[PDB]
Structures are given as C-alpha cells and as structure tokens.
Design a protein around this ligand. Structure first.
Ligand SMILES: *[C@@H]1O[C@H](CO)[C@@H](O)[C@H](O)[C@H]1NC(C)=O
Length: 269
C-alpha cells in the first residue's frame, strides 16, 4: 500500500511519461498546451501545463521528449520518451558498462543510456536551470517510461546537487548500471527516485544481473493486472538492492505488462 498523495503523484507522472510518446509532443511550439491523442494523459491535460521545450532525435543519442511548466501543480517536468520495444533494444544499444566516475566514484552505467544523456545534458541542464530561476517554488521532476525512465534516472543522478531538488519517477525502466551505481541511486541526496514496476514486465528484468547490472532500492511494484485500474492497495514497496519480492522474480516475464502503468503507456500516436 501507498498513501493517496503518493498514488496521485505516481499516476500523474505515468501520464507525463505517456505524453512523451505522442509525436505532436516532440515537435510542439514553446508555450502551447500539452495534450495527448485520446485518453493518454487526462491528468496532464486538465492542468495548466505548457511546453518549455519539445525535442525529437536530439543529440547524437537521438533523445526525444519534452520539458513542461505546470502552474497547477507547481512543477517543472522533464519527460523522456522510451521505446515500444520489449527486447530488441538489448540488441540495438550498447549494454557494456561505461565508467561514470563524474556521477559517482566506482559507478558504471549502460553505455547507450549514459552516452545519450551526455549528448543532450548541457542543453537540458540549462533549460531546467532557467525554469528553476523563474519558478524557484516549483518542484523539478524527471520522468519516463522504459528507456525514457532510464534516461530520467541517469539525468537526475547527474544533475542533482546544484541547488534544487530533482525527483525521478520511472515506469518499467531497465537497470541502468552496476552495484555501485545502484547503491548511489539508493542514497543520493538532493531528491528522490521512485522506481515503479508492473507485475512481470520483462523490461525491469534487463539487462540481466549477469551482465553486471543491479537495481536501486526501493521498488514500487504494481501487482494489479494488465488493463486493471490501479488502487493504492495494489502498490507494494519492496526494499533492498536487487530485492526479489516484486518484479525481480524467477517466473515467466511478459511484454504486454510493460504497456500498462496506471493506464496505456507507449501507445500514444
Ligand atoms: C490552453 O489552455 C488554457 C487552459 O488551461 C486555455 O485558457 C487556453 O485558451 C488554451 N490555449 C489554446 C491555444 O487553446
């Protein structure tokens, strides 16, 4: 179980994550209102949420998403688009672990995710920082589904410690680095990581532990099924680095489970 307040936040940032897949939300003019095709992001649409910056195939890593200003909720939200792909990104991106000592000593991270973030980090840092200066009472939140949640995690770990908090909400994110990095993400000051998983979603089970990857603690495990509305009683907090009580169980994994985090995610055209 989680509190109604935390539940509301999880639901909201799931929809900010879903919104990053809508193609119109990656080429939107600054200052325009954020909307989604169909029913992908009603909690976002119902807010005074507008684009600060919308980006597509940005940097050598081709990162896609948006930066939003939400006056209703007093948020600055950086949302990274993930992928439709359950498995193929294992074959298509470099899962070698690269040194990231500039983030944390002895830390290593996925080459692809880290390289991709690095290619856009200066530009996105400056935009986030400008927004913070204009709205110092607003909360900075980085979010994303799947590979987007991995990017949000790396980005948050990198940009914390510069005078404003960064919270991260990830949905169905893969592991992002080694045990040192997982430990760092468990204790890092300057914001909170909320790492959310669903039932037997395959993506948070990748890359394998035996590729040298570990998950940070804790985990917020959604136990309700695919296409089942989530209640606060359906979310279990699982403690421990590489804990096995939640998503990380030795049973058959699933791809459809990856697409249901409070509502459909990865399906907005
Ligand atoms: C954007 O949404 C606000 C309400 O949140 C509304 O006042 C405004 O007219 C909308 N803009 C456009 C161009 O429709």
């Amino acid at each position: 179980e989680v509190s109604q307040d935390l539940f509301n936040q999880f639901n909201l940032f799931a929809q900010y994550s879903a919104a990053a897949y809508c193609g119109k939300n990656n080429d939107a003019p600054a200052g325009t209102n954020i909307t989604c095709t169909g029913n992908a992001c009603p909690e976002v649409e119902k807010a005074d949420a507008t684009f600060l910056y919308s980006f597509e195939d940005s940097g050598v890593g081709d990162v896609t998403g948006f930066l939003a200003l939400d006056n209703t909720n007093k948020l600055i939200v950086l949302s990274f688009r993930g992928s439709r792909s359950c498995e193929n990104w294992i074959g298509n991106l470099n899962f070698d672990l690269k040194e990231i000592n500039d983030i944390c000593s002895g830390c290593r991270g996925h080459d692809g995710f880290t390289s991709s973030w690095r290619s856009v980090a200066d530009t996105l840092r400056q935009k986030v920082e400008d927004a913070v200066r204009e709205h110092p009472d607003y909360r900075v939140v980085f979010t994303g589904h799947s590979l987007g949640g991995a990017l949000a995690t790396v980005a948050g770990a990198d940009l914390r410690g510069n005078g404003y908090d960064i919270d991260v909400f990830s949905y169905g994110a893969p592991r992002v680095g080694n045990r040192a990095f997982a430990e760092f993400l468990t204790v890092q000051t300057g914001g909170t990581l909320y790492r959310i998983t669903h039932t037997n979603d395959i993506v948070p089970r990748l890359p394998p532990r035996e590729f040298g990857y570990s998950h940070s603690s804790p985990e917020y495990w959604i136990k309700s099924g695919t296409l089942v509305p989530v209640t606060r009683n359906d979310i279990v907090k699982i403690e421990g680095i590489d804990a096995t009580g939640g998503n990380n169980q030795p049973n058959i994994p699933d791809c459809p489970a990856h697409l249901w985090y409070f509502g459909l995610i990865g399906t907005c055209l």
